[PDB]
Every structure is written in C-alpha cells, then in structure tokens.
Amino acid sequence: VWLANPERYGQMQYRYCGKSGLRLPALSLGLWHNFGHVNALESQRAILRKAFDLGITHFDLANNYGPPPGSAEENFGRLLREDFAAYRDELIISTKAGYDMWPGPYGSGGSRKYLLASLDQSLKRMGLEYVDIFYSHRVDENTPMEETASALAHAVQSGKALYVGISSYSPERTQKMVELLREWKIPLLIHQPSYNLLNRWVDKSGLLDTLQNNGVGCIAFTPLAQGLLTGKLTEANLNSLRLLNEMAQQRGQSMAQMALSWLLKDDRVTSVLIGASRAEQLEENVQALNNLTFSTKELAQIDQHIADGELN
Amino acid sequence: WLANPERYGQMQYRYCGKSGLRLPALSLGLWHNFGHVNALESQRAILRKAFDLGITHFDLANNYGPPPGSAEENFGRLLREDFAAYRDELIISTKAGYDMWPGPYGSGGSRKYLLASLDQSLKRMGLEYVDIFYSHRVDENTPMEETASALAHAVQSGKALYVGISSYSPERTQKMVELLREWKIPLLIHQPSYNLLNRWVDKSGLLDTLQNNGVGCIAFTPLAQGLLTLTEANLNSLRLLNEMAQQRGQSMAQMALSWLLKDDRVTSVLIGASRAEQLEENVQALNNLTFSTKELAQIDQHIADGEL
Amino acid sequence: WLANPERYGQMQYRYCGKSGLRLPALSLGLWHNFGHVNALESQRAILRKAFDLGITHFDLANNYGPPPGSAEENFGRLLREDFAAYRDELIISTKAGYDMWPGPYGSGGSRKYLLASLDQSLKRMGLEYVDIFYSHRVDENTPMEETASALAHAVQSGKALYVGISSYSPERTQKMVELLREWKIPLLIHQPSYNLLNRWVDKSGLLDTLQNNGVGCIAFTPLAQGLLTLNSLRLLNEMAQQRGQSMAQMALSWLLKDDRVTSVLIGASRAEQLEENVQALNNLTFSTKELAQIDQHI
Amino acid sequence: VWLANPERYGQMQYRYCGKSGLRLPALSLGLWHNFGHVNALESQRAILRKAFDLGITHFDLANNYGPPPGSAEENFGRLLREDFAAYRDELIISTKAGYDMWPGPYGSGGSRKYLLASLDQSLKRMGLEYVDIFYSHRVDENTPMEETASALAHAVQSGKALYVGISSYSPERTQKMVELLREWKIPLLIHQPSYNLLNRWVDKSGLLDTLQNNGVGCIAFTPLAQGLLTGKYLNGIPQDSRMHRLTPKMLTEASLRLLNEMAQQRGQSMAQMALSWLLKDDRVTSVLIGASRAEQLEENVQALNNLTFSTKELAQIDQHIADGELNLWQASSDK
Amino acid sequence: VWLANPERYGQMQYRYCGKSGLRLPALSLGLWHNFGHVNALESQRAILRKAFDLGITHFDLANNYGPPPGSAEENFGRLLREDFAAYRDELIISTKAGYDMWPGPYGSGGSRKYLLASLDQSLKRMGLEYVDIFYSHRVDENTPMEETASALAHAVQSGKALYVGISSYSPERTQKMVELLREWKIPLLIHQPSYNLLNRWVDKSGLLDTLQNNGVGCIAFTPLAQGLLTGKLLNEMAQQRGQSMAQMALSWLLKDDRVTSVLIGASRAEQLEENVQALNNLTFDGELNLWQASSDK
Ligand SMILES: NC(=O)c1ccc[n+]([C@@H]2O[C@H](COP(=O)([O-])OP(=O)(O)OC[C@H]3O[C@@H](n4cnc5c(N)ncnc54)[C@H](OP(=O)(O)O)[C@@H]3O)[C@@H](O)[C@H]2O)c1
Ligand SMILES: NC(=O)c1ccc[n+]([C@@H]2O[C@H](COP(=O)([O-])OP(=O)(O)OC[C@H]3O[C@@H](n4cnc5c(N)ncnc54)[C@H](OP(=O)(O)O)[C@@H]3O)[C@@H](O)[C@H]2O)c1
Ligand SMILES: NC(=O)c1ccc[n+]([C@@H]2O[C@H](COP(=O)([O-])OP(=O)(O)OC[C@H]3O[C@@H](n4cnc5c(N)ncnc54)[C@H](OP(=O)(O)O)[C@@H]3O)[C@@H](O)[C@H]2O)c1
Ligand SMILES: NC(=O)c1ccc[n+]([C@@H]2O[C@H](COP(=O)([O-])OP(=O)(O)OC[C@H]3O[C@@H](n4cnc5c(N)ncnc54)[C@H](OP(=O)(O)O)[C@@H]3O)[C@@H](O)[C@H]2O)c1
C-alpha cells in the first residue's frame, strides 16, 4: 500500500496550458528513456513515485518508447495499477503516434489507420480507458492533414483522449492543424517541440507567436539537449560550455538547472519535459524553479557565448 | 505461425488517392476460393503466402462464398488462428449492396440493409471494425443521401475506418463524394471492373473523376477472369498479346497486371488465387511496369484487330 | 435446418452394457473426412445425413484431422450452425492417449495430458462437457491409478458424463473397472478394433470381461477401413450376395449379430455410404453354417 | 511473435517422477533468484526462452520469490502471456506456500487459511487457472499435518493444482503426508529437498528410500550449492556473481580444489560434475538449477553427456568431501 | 488511501485455535452491535481501523446483525472494499445462520435450505468469495444434526467457508457435531459460547473439557456481560491489580489456554485501546445468559 507525499502540491509550479483550463506542472516527466524492459521495474517505480511526490503530475509517453517499442507504456500501466490506483484522476498521461512502431505501411506516419489503431494499442498496453493528451508525433507530408486532424477528432469524440496535441510541426502546419481541428470544435491543446538553450528553431521560426496567437501550450522536449547542457565537440564548443557552466555557478545553479530555468523564464513555455534515470535527478531539476529570473545582460551573455562557441 | 520477415522488402505500396493509406499494388480478393466448398487448409496456404509477399489488403463482401457469408467466416477463423498478432498490419474490407438474404431488407442501399449487414460481417469475421466498408453497387431506388449517411454512421460509430464505393458511374461517384463531405468524410476508394479488355473506366471519365476528387482506384477482375491469362479473331489477338508478353519476359497475366499498374491512375489491382503459386507469379508483374509508346499502340492495335 | 422428424423410426438402439445409455447400433466416427483438408460443406452433408438416419453418436479424439484438432473444431462449428437445438439428443465423445502435441505431456496417460487435453477438446468443440471421455490407449509407464483418477476428475468436475477406454487388454480393463469403482464410477464403454478380419477381441476373452462388468463395446474399423467392402474376399462377397447384402453390410451385420457389441463405429466420406451401411440392420441373423463358412474362408 | 526451437525435445532427458506418469526434465529451472522486479525483464525473457529451447519444461516458483515477494510469479505470468501463449500445456509450473509471505499470523506456516489464500494469490499473479504442482514449502510443527494435507487435497479437488508436493520434510513427516493424502485418494507426487555434493542429509536420513517406497519423486534444490560447486570461487569472488550481490563465510578451509580435479579428469566442468553426480541415481527425478544468464543453461545441460561414476570416484567423494555446513533449510528437515 | 499501523502485529497475543494451525487474536471484535444502518458509517470505520491497528484480525458477524438484519454484513463489506482492499488475507471473517433472519419456515433454524441460502446472502452482502468461518449459530432440535453438519460440509467443499464452527451447543451435541463432521474429513474448528465471570455454564457443563479433548477452539462471547463487568467490590480487586474492571474481566477469561479468544464489542475506538491492555496482566451466577435455550438442549 503506497501513500503519495501529502505536501506534493505545495512546492511545484503549475502553468495553464495556452488558453485552456488545464494546468501542467512546470516540469513534466518523459518516459523516452529508462522505462523499457531493459530497465529494472524497481528503478522505474522509484522514479515515478518521486516524480509524483514532487508534484509532477504529467507523464509523457509514446507508442515506441522502450526499448523495446511499447514497453514504456506497458511498464507504466503496471506501475499505474500497483501504485497509482487511487491517483489516475490527478495525472495527465499522454501518448503519441507518428514514428516507426510496427512493421509495414500502417506502422508509421499520419494515416487514420495508424493513429487510431495505435491509440487502441497504447490504451490496452497502459490499461487505460483514455489518455489525457493524444498527439500526432511528427509531420507526415504524405498524409493530408485533414486526415490526421480528423483522426485526432475521432479520438476525442469517442472518449479515447480528453485533448489533442502535435509535435515537431512547423508554424504553418501548426496553424493549419488548429484550423482543421476548429472545424470539429476542438481546440488544439499543446505543441511539443525540441527546444533548449542550444536549439532555438522555435524562436527563429516564429512558432511561439503561432502558439500564443492560437492559445496553444508549449512543452519543451530535450530541454537539456540530452545531457549536453548538464556539464557531463570542438575546442570552441567546450570552452563556451565551460563559460555557460560558470554563469550557472554565478547564479547558484547547476548547468542543468540554468538550462531549465532559461526555458521557464517566461510564460512562453508551459512545461519542460525532463528525463531521469534516478530519483536524485528529479530532486535537482525541480530546484530550477527557485531561480527563474534572468537579467537582460545575462540573456545577452548566454547568447554571446553560444555565438562564440558555435553551439547554434 | 511466423510471417516472412522480408515481407515488406519487395512489394510496392501506393497511396490511395489523396489519403495517407498505402495499399499494396496487388491486393487479394476473396470472391472465389474461400467458401465452405473449399478446404480450409487450401485457404490458409493462400492467405499466408499473400501476407508473406507483402499483400496487406484482403477484400471481402457479405455474399462471398459459396455459400453467402462463408468467405467472411473462413477469413475470421484464419485471422484468429494465424493473424492474431497481425491485424493492425492488414487492411480488411467488406461490402453490402447485392442479394445477401431474402426479402426487401437483404439487398440494395438502404440504411437498414447496410448497417444490419455491416454488423453481420463484423460478427462473421470476429472484428471490431473493417478498415474499408463499401456500398457494393448502385441502388437507384434508395436516395444516395440515405446510403451516404449509412456509410457515415459506420465511420462515426467506429465500425469502419474508411468508406468506399463500387461500380458507381462518374456522376454518382461525384455526388457520393459531395454527400460524404457534408459529414467531413472523404471517400477513400472506388472499386470498378477494369482490365486491358474493359476500359469503360477510362472512356467514361471515371479515372479523371477519381483523381480530381483524390479517390483511389482498385481494379476488379484485372485478368478479365482468366481471359488475360471466343471468336477466331479474339483468340488470334490473345495469341499476339501473349507473344508481346513473352517478348517482355512476362506471362500474359503479368503483362495484364503491369499494364494496369504502368501509371499512378490505379492504386491497386485486386487479384484472386486458387493456390499460392499464382500469387507468386502475379506479384512478379512489379519487375516490369514500363511500357514504351510503341508497345501501348501495338497492344491497343491487337485489341482493335481481335475486337476484344 | 430441420432434422428428419422420422429420424428415430428406423435405427436400432442398444443399451450400453448395464447402463441406461442407449447407443445407435451404427455410430459415426470422425477419424477421417473431417479435417481442414476436407471442405466444410461435404462434412455438413455427412453429419446431417447421419442424424437424419438416427445416428445420435459421434466419436472424436483430440488428434483427429488432419491436422490434429481440426475434426473437433469443424464439429464444433457444425454443432453451433446446425445442431444448436439438438445437443441434448447427441452423444459426443473425445479421447486422449496418442501423440497430440510435442513433448512429454503431449502423449500417454498422465493426469497432466488427459486433463489438459480434455480442456483443449472442450474449447475446440465449444462444449461444456462431452458425453464420453476416453483413455485412448494403454500407457504402460503411467500407473492406471493415475489414468483412472484423471477420468474420475473429469466426471466429478462435470466435464464428462461418462468415461471409457480404448484398446485395453482384458486384464487392464478389469483393473480399470475396479479403480473407477473406488470412485463410484462405472466404466461405461470399451472401444476395440474389431472386424471379420481382426478378432483379438474374441480370442482374448474381452467380450466376456465386458459382459461380466456391464461394460459396453463399440467396434472400431468395423470394415477394416474399406477392405471389407483376394480369392477369399471374393468368396465372402458371394456369401454377402447370397444374403442379399453388400459385403460392407454383411461385415457390419456380423459384428452386430450378438448382443455383445453395443455399436459399430463406421466412417463415411459421403452421405450415400451412411444410407447403405444402416441397411445392415435388415439382416442381423447368421446360421451356424454361415459362421463356419465365414471362418473357413477367412 | 516467438517460435521455440523445433528440436527442443531432441537432447533433454526426461525422467518419470516417482511412480507417476509425469515426466520431468532431468534439469529444471528455478526462479528463486534473477526474476524479481530488481532484474530487467529482457534478461529474464532470454533465460526462459533458452531454458525451453533446451527442453527444460519445468519452472519452479514460490509465492515469495523475487524480490520483492511475488514478483517472480508476476514476471513469469507476463512472460507466459507474451512468449508462451501457445505452450502452457507443454510446461510444468509449480508454486508453494510455507515461508513468510505477508504480514501477520496468516502469512506464514502451514494452515489452510495461508495455503489456500496464497494459492489464489499465486494463480492471480501468474495469470493461470491452475499450477501443475502445488507444494507445502516447509514443515510447520504447529499446524497438524491433517490440516495441511487437506488444504493440498482441496487444491487438487477444486482444480487449482494438478498434483501436490512437499519440500524439506523429514522421512517420518513425508511418510505421514503420503498417508494423509492417500485418505483423499491423492498420491504425493514429489519431494523437493536441498541436496548436493556438499549437503547430503537426503542420503544420511534415508529420505531416498522413503520416497522410492512410496513412489514419490525427488527434485534436488541448490544442486550447485548456489554456485560454490561451480569453481567460480576458486581464485576470487567475481563481480558478476551471486556472492558479490551465499557469502564468503561459506568458503571455509573445508573440497572444491579436489572436486575440480576430478571434474577435469572426467572432461567436465565442476558444475557439470556436481549435476551429473546428483543424476547418477534413478531416484533423483531432476536437479533444480538457477541461472543468471542463458550461457549457464547451455553449459549445465551438458551434464547429461556423462552420468556415470566408478566405485573409486564415488569412494573418493564420500571419503574426501565433508559436509559444507550450507543447508540453510535444515530447520524444516530436522523436525 | 489508508495505511494500517506497521507495528500492528507487535503487541497482540495470538493463540492457536484448538488443534488447528489457525491463530486467532486473544481479543476479537464482534459486530453484533454498533454496525447497523442506525449507526454512522464514519463511527464504524474508526472502530474497525483501530481494531486492525491493534492487531485484532478477527471480525465476527452473523446474518441478522444490525439493525436492521443484514446491515452489519453490508456495512462491513463496504468498509472492507474501501479500507481493507489490500488486507482481506490478513483477516479472519465469520458469519452464521441459525436465528430468525427472514420470514417463514426457511428463515430460521438448522436446515440445509436455510444455512446454504443464508451463507449465499451473507457472501453477497459482504462482497466476499468465502468466509473464513461459517457457524451453525444455535441448536435446532427439529433438524437432525446430520443435515446441519452436511450443510456445513458442503460450505467447505464448495469453497464458500474455509472452516466451520458452532455456537451455544451443549457438550453432548458438540461431540456429536465433531463426529459427524469427521465423517466428511472436516475438523470442527471452534465453539462460540457465552462465557464471562458471571456466566460459567461452560465450566460447570464440562464444555471446555469436550473442546480440549476434541481439539476445538473456544471463543467467548459477551465476555463483559454486555458492559455490566465494566463498572458503568469486584472493582476494588481490579483496582488492586492496576486494572479497570473491564480489563480484569477479560484477563480472567484469558488466564488459561482454555479460551482461544474473547469476543468484545466496542462503540468507540478508545474502548479497544483499553481492552487490549488486559494482555499486560493475565495472572491470577448473574442470570444473564440470554442464549441458554440453545445450550440446554
Ligand atoms: N516529441 C518528440 O519528438 C520527443 C523527442 C525527444 C524527447 N521527447 C520527450 O522529452 C523527454 C526529455 O527528453 P530527454 O530524456 O532527452 O530529456 P533531457 O531532460 O534532454 O535529458 C534527460 C536525461 O539527462 C540526464 N539528466 C536529467 N537531469 C539531470 C541532472 N540534474 N543532472 C545530470 N543529468 C541529468 C538523465 O540521463 P542519465 O541517466 O544518462 O544521466 C536523463 O535521462 C523525454 O522523456 C520524452 O518524452 C520528445
Ligand atoms: N479408438 C481407436 O484407436 C480408433 C482407431 C481407428 C478408428 N477409430 C474410430 O472408428 C471409426 C471408424 O474407423 P474407419 O473410418 O477406418 O472405419 P471403417 O468403417 O473400417 O472404414 C470407413 C471408410 O470405409 C469407406 N466406406 C464406409 N462405408 C462404405 C460403403 N458402404 N461402401 C464403400 N466404402 C465405404 C469410406 O472410405 P472411402 O470412401 O474414403 O474409401 C469410409 O471413410 C473412426 O471414425 C473412429 O471414430 C477408433
Ligand atoms: N524448497 C526450497 O526451500 C528451496 C530453497 C532454495 C531454492 N529452491 C529452488 O531451487 C532453485 C535453485 O536454487 P539456486 O539458484 O540456489 O540453485 P544452484 O543451481 O545451486 O545455483 C544457481 C546459481 O548458480 C550460478 N550458476 C549456475 N550455473 C552456472 C555455471 N554453469 N557457471 C557459473 N555459475 C553458474 C548462477 O548464479 P550467479 O550467476 O548469479 O552467480 C545461478 O543463479 C531455486 O530457483 C528454487 O526453484 C528451493
Ligand atoms: N453466538 C452468539 O449467540 C452471540 C451472542 C451475543 C454476542 N456474540 C458475539 O460476541 C460479540 C460481543 O458481544 P457484546 O458486545 O455483548 O460483548 P461485550 O464484550 O460483553 O460488550 C461490549 C460492549 O461493552 C461496552 N464496553 C466495551 N468495552 C468497554 C470498556 N473498556 N469500558 C467501558 N465500556 C465498554 C460497549 O458498549 P457501550 O459502549 O455502548 O456501553 C460495547 O458495545 C458480539 O459482537 C458477537 O459477535 C455472539
């Protein structure tokens, strides 16, 4: 019998997702790594329990997370049944379809076949009646967005997803998906782009404007550039990373914490989607919330060191 | 049973019209050879070979057998036995429109027949849904509004992922596209008879209507039920068409299929089989999909000369 | 589908040993012609004709097909389609003992094999229980106490109404009667190979063991697989002609000439063969002279 | 989809269990270690697939195997569903109740309450309608054997277990259990004692004679003394070993260097000889090995190539291999 | 989510029930009163939680406990589902049939009809596959004991009761029930008689000897004479021992290995806390046996 921390909602920051009434935790946990059948279930269990005890209420999955593909969703479903029986309604669970999942022409892409068949498999693996958020995981340029949109609408209409989202769509495609979903009277909830201090296509492309103009949330994935922004590649690269680490030290933050605080420095990002291989990493990362302020000078110096090391 | 791991290596897949659904260039139909009059072991060897060759689309109708219904039952049986892990790699269709059961609700295009028939097909196959449900033919006594709305209810209720029509004129096809658009459903596919010796589809303007509306085309009786495998002039022309195939290094069947697949106007050709070896032969059509301008003229000329 | 209303008018039924169960004098076996290699419509026409002739007993085993299990599955399908309203008018048997599935639990007489096999058979046929469950053969490496107790568990648990054995010697039969009596279950039936050209049953004393213990006898391969349909076979055919019978009919009548045999378990590949075979019942008498001449030729 | 090795039944030896018709593989796999939630499911899957591909058809479990308790049974149930859907009827699956499993007075021991509640939990964890063998896992001197026996009989009668067994019972208690089960017309199938070259209470006590006289099988547990009889601890304690994760207290001055020579002389590893030795007698039905990786199964099954020992060999072993003081289950067998 | 006290098994004493392997807590909770639909569910919840947190693992019910009849079993089923979902297998739950439950000739007594139909209703009310102990609740002199026994034996054989018991049977009828149940290879587990300082028919009749000789446990009911032995001259002896009167009355029953358990009631948690402290000092007619009709037959 497991009891979650009664103070779990006392310290975490929650942000409204775009114009919706759904509040996401400022840090969410992704299950891309460390939740496959290659990882011991006890290690996974400790991570999920610590995340919920820190008030992280959003867990982000996809069909092909593991390895092997599907295993994160299965393991998550097991831990849900064992430790989160009483807590499902306090969690926001997402899954996605778009990348290679199973063999053949219906195992990848953006067709109605793949999306709806995949959603069913994901709900069965996780033991859920519905996900909170179902995503088109990437752009499929060979499926008309009308078809992808109508699949997402069917997920909602049928009660298999409460809300829908997209991931790695250009601003123009995002705008088209908002419009197609509006024809079904469904608001696009959220957009999940890769976004970190060293990868700012989101800024440069004008995505954040499209999102804000349409009331769509933003959840940043690989916010630590998969560990590059943690301190653990040319000479100028390393020297810049060293200087960024020194800025983080000046702020009283690890490099990881400053990378997260930077994404969260303004309202433009709803949540950052962190990974963890152990509970202590969650404890460190959520402390990013203790220092979300950057001076104009700091923001310039950060961009400058990135310019100087050619980390763009 | 384990499907061939290399099954997706050689088959060609085509997007169905403007949709994201990729059909195999050759699909298997179950019109013949899958009734209760046919041994289940023979059926099993055919379906297993089809999937091993990368044929992912299996086309059924309520009344396929004989007797009526039995193709769907037998398929369902084999699906459970051998394809338990593979449903989501398959495109399965059924249809309603011809005589299936006695009386005024057993044929035609009414909401009663279509929906009651879809339910019977899902139960016989053991499926929650078909990938493609079709109106199997035109019913001039049911308003197309009723037929279209029945197809829409199928989609809405989760009993069919997509819908199609079979043997509709270009004008009726265009009206069905429009009626289904009112429901925000794109018509996926049209299934006409179409082969070297039967080109109403081209001449009527059907292929243009399909392409213009982003509807796929799957050719039924692509071998003219074996003719492409009778007066003197007919036979003599078929002999010459056979010789052109020989020149190409193809059987007549393979050339007949390649010809339909020579361009993007056809999504798929719907072949039958009574044994596994015929599937092996037919899919080799993909090795030679090119026809010169001269070849296409000579083919049409021999067809003209034999009055085929 | 409606069964012939006169189906009980002509068939002869015999009490199985001392029990109250009446079997038809001719029963249908599904050893051949009911596999996935045989079209279902042909199978359907055979079963409908058998029931229309009053044959109420259908004999199956786990490994009947081919492939193994397919007879039981095809039977289950036809039961559901055509015999939905008639299950309680039918006596259905199955068996375990021969090779069914790979490995050490897929053959023989163990509790593991018999009880697992029964479960698979009931699932393949779509039945809550069989009327008769059999040990299909002797397993000299499993103690009979184990085999018997498995059969008893089948009865106690409601998976089989009665139990039987097949191809057991008179001595092993007697032991199985005794082991089952310890459970207060009477052995219903013995199924031996028995025909004009294979009479170990007579020579061994089996029929006496069966009668003494009230156990029924159902003869399998009663036509020696079709052989009883060269110079001696010619003369046996001439005796059949003299009786106004086909050779097949005489072979069956011969087995049924005594109260010693409850039923003969025929196979059929088409309906017409059933129609011919049941007419054996029109001439069940043999003179002493005939019986001698038959033995003399054969 | 997964396909088992078609030749899986070509090399393994199967032995009739006592006087029953149940044939166990001469090597069985136990899930005491390496199948908990602390062990990756992929590693477990590779072990079970290799075991079945070698013809090992018997998997032995217990309620409290893991860690944590219950997790071996849950993981096994998952793998059964995923890889062995078509093969359940080719497997012999056991579980047990008798050690500490859950808190309180009903969570340990031999009572009808504990045994029947536990069997239900094991079936639910494994996703099975029944186990092939249900055991009383040890002696409980405070529960009358009549109660324990009757609980095992209810397991059989109700269809939750095909056969029943006992583990670590003295010859006298074994004999009583055979008698009490006979009153229910159930034959006791099997006895599971600790038995290896360095732990021979089974020989000394007369247990093998009791078992044969009652037609009861014998499945030898810790047949490698947990790894000690593998030689893996002759020149150091390896990183990837149970002892680094069974302690170095067991490596006393008191055998292994001598035994290793004898094994070399036979063309066997020490592990193989240890197994062959248990299997030299037709009264040992099987040896119940553990494995932390597939390669260990491949080595161990080759024990079956050399099951013969000369009088001299047996004499030297009896002379020169003293009790190892490693029977951690002696409490049960001394009652 | 509710978590039971992790030290719940640290203080309670457990006793083997007769010759069986089943260990009952020395104090068990009965639901005769205070668990009907006339009692707030929150109050009931606080009592059961405290009982378990003190290591009391046995809860004793009957079909007609309430009021109204059946309601204790229903309330208990609810609380089981809400707070004891993870703990069923740590609990010993009993029910009974024998007194008036429903109208008519099948609603009382010892017939196979009443006992088996009643067991099915009890299991449905409590949401349980089986009870740990099913009892014949009293003697029915108009049903042959062979019938009652066989009904108890069917409960066990069918998996609806793990063990069976009897309540308020004379020594002679107890002995007959032991013998009848042995013909089914079932040992009678337990006898539940009224027994307290002011009501000792159990001693005088020879029942404790019959029980011990047959390996049957004894669970004492109305051990506080319903509250009379709580205080609301004996009180002065209790004071001398450093005990409340209640504690001394319970200690007295538990002074011997003759009593497996004393079956207390409670209307609030604090009474459980007080009563279990009886275990700290186990060393040493009121005309109130309202269940004497049954024990006199
Ligand atoms: N939609 C998409 O296309 C997409 C693509 C990628 C990811 N994502 C999502 O985003 C999530 C985040 O991606 P990611 O795993 O690359 O996240 P990240 O936050 O970029 O890196 C996470 C990893 O960095 C390490 N780490 C985390 N906190 C740390 C700390 N305080 N100090 C040192 N190291 C630390 C851990 O790895 P070690 O255990 O190796 O130390 C952890 O597993 C995923 O789980 C997934 O759901 C989505
Ligand atoms: N317990 C055991 O060990 C065991 C072993 C074997 C059989 N059996 C049982 O015994 C049953 C009978 O075995 P069986 O099929 O060999 O029996 P059989 O009656 O000796 O031979 C039947 C076959 O003979 C042919 N036949 C039948 N009637 C005929 C007629 N009137 N005219 C011409 N040909 C005729 C048919 O074969 P064609 O028409 O194809 O030539 C038919 O399939 C089985 O179905 C089975 O249930 C049991
Ligand atoms: N009834 C009971 O009370 C009881 C008690 C104990 C056990 N058991 C049963 O008996 C089974 C076996 O117990 P056990 O695992 O201690 O038996 P074991 O066979 O004495 O020990 C097996 C361990 O030895 C190592 N090993 C095996 N083969 C090897 C080789 N060829 N080379 C090197 N190392 C090798 C492995 O450990 P590492 O690789 O991790 O070092 C493996 O996990 C249990 O799984 C359970 O089913 C029952
Ligand atoms: N088999 C049968 O025929 C039969 C018959 C009767 C009972 N029983 C069983 O035995 C159980 C016990 O019956 P019972 O409730 O009369 O038993 P009891 O132990 O004689 O009395 C319990 C009652 O005494 C009062 N009390 C308890 N502890 C106290 C304390 N420490 N200080 C002050 N007052 C205290 C409480 O009543 P207040 O707090 O409201 O005053 C409580 O409801 C029943 O629940 C039932 O399961 C069986």
Side-chain angles (χ1 to χ4, degrees), chain B residues 9-35:
Chain B
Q10 307 268 39
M11 181 54 59
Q12 180 188 93
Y13 299 86
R14 297 181 173 205
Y15 289 88
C16 187
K18 278 178 183 132
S19 83
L21 191 75
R22 303 161 74 197
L23 293 181
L26 297 90
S27 296
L28 179 71
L30 282 77
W31 180 36
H32 305 303
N33 312 316
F34 289 84

Side-chain angles (χ1 to χ4, degrees), chain C residues 27-33 58-61 64 95 98 134 136-137 166-167 191-193 195 219-227 229 246 248-249 252 265-270 272-274 276-277:
Chain C
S27 294
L28 182 69
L30 281 78
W31 183 32
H32 299 123
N33 310 319
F58 299 89
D59 181 79
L60 297 95
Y64 292 174
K95 322 184 182 80
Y98 287 90
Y134 286 87
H136 206 166
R137 60 152 164 197
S166 178
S167 309
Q191 180 170 132
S193 55
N195 59 58
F220 87 76
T221 52
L223 299 168
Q225 306 202 46
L227 221 58
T229 62
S246 64
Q249 293 167 333
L252 300 165
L265 192 49
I266 56 169
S269 59
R270 56 181 196 282
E272 292 74 6
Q273 293 176 339
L274 297 174
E276 179 185 350
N277 291 354

Side-chain angles (χ1 to χ4, degrees), chain D residues 32 262 325:
Chain D
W32 181 34
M262 293 188 62
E325 295 163 344

Side-chain angles (χ1 to χ4, degrees), chain E residues 14-27:
Chain E
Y14 301 89
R15 297 181 174 203
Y16 286 87
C17 188
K19 277 177 186 122
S20 81
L22 194 71
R23 302 160 71 196
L24 294 182
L27 295 95

Side-chain angles (χ1 to χ4, degrees), chain A residues 30-34 60 65 96 99 137 167-168 192 221-227 230 232 256 273-278 281 284-285:
Chain A
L31 282 71
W32 181 31
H33 298 126
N34 307 322
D60 180 79
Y65 291 173
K96 323 185 184 81
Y99 288 91
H137 202 161
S167 179
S168 306
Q192 182 170 127
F221 86 77
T222 56
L224 300 177
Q226 308 203 46
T230 68
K232 278 174 270 167
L273 193 50
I274 56 165
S277 59
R278 55 181 197 282
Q281 295 178 336
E284 176 185 347
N285 290 358

Side-chain angles (χ1 to χ4, degrees), chain D residues 14-303:
Chain D
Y14 302 92
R15 296 183 173 204
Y16 286 88
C17 188
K19 278 178 184 125
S20 84
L22 195 67
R23 306 158 73 198
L24 296 179
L27 300 87
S28 296
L29 182 70
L31 282 79
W32 181 34
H33 297 123
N34 314 311
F35 292 84
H37 296 329
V38 305
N39 300 104
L41 193 73
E42 285 304 301
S43 309
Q44 302 183 35
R45 180 195 310 287
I47 300 168
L48 293 190
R49 289 177 174 187
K50 179 55 68 165
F52 194 55
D53 285 337
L54 299 169
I56 297 171
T57 56
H58 179 36
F59 299 92
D60 179 83
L61 294 98
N63 59 0
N64 69 16
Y65 293 172
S71 60
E73 281 181 336
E74 283 175 51
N75 291 323
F76 183 74
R78 282 196 235 104
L79 298 167
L80 228 45
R81 208 145 40 234
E82 285 165 17
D83 291 338
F84 298 89
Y87 303 127
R88 142 91 185 110
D89 290 352
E90 293 175 53
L91 305 175
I92 301 305
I93 301 164
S94 65
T95 200
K96 323 184 184 78
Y99 291 89
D100 290 2
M101 175 71 192
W102 68 83
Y106 320 120
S108 198
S111 63
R112 183 185 180 75
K113 166 65 170 185
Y114 171 52
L115 265 61
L116 295 178
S118 187
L119 176 58
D120 290 342
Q121 293 183 8
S122 290
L123 293 172
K124 182 186 298 210
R125 280 188 299 265
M126 293 189 281
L128 287 174
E129 298 275 290
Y130 56 81
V131 291
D132 301 278
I133 312 175
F134 184 51
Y135 290 86
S136 171
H137 205 161
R138 60 151 168 200
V139 169
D140 179 358
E141 71 269 25
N142 291 336
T143 298
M145 280 189 281
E146 289 74 10
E147 185 177 330
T148 305
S150 165
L152 297 170
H154 187 86
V156 171
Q157 295 162 6
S158 69
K160 290 171 181 177
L162 295 177
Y163 303 92
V164 290
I166 63 182
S167 182
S168 308
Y169 278 55
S170 71
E172 304 63 29
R173 287 175 173 277
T174 296
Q175 180 65 63
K176 189 54 176 325
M177 290 295 282
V178 169
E179 285 159 21
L180 290 167
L181 286 171
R182 272 193 202 125
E183 294 169 10
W184 290 104
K185 295 181 73 64
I186 296 168
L188 174 63
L189 174 70
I190 192 170
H191 188 299
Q192 180 174 134
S194 55
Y195 187 23
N196 57 61
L197 267 174
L198 306 172
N199 173 4
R200 306 200 199 175
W201 76 267
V202 159
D203 296 334
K204 180 179 181 184
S205 69
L207 182 68
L208 296 188
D209 300 334
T210 304
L211 294 186
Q212 175 169 44
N213 290 353
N214 286 285
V216 179
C218 181
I219 180 166
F221 87 76
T222 53
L224 298 173
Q226 308 202 43
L228 220 74
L229 287 163
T230 63
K232 82 207 278 161
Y233 306 129
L234 292 154
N235 301 57
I237 298 168
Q239 291 265 298
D240 195 344
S241 78
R242 186 179 291 172
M243 197 181 278
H244 190 261
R245 292 183 242 100
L246 180 88
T247 69
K249 283 172 271 163
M250 285 169 172
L251 293 158
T252 69
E253 189 33 58
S255 270
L256 288 170
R257 70 186 95 271
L258 181 106
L259 285 173
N260 199 51
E261 192 208 283
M262 293 188 62
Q264 281 186 304
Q265 293 318 126
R266 297 166 56 81
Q268 295 192 296
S269 65
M270 172 132 35
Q272 294 165 339
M273 184 180 88
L275 298 171
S276 301
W277 185 88
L278 285 159
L279 287 168
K280 78 192 172 285
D281 189 298
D282 67 354
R283 296 177 299 168
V284 174
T285 318
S286 191
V287 302
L288 192 42
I289 59 165
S292 59
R293 57 191 92 267
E295 291 76 2
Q296 293 168 357
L297 295 172
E298 288 166 325
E299 177 185 352
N300 293 348
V301 300
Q302 292 172 67

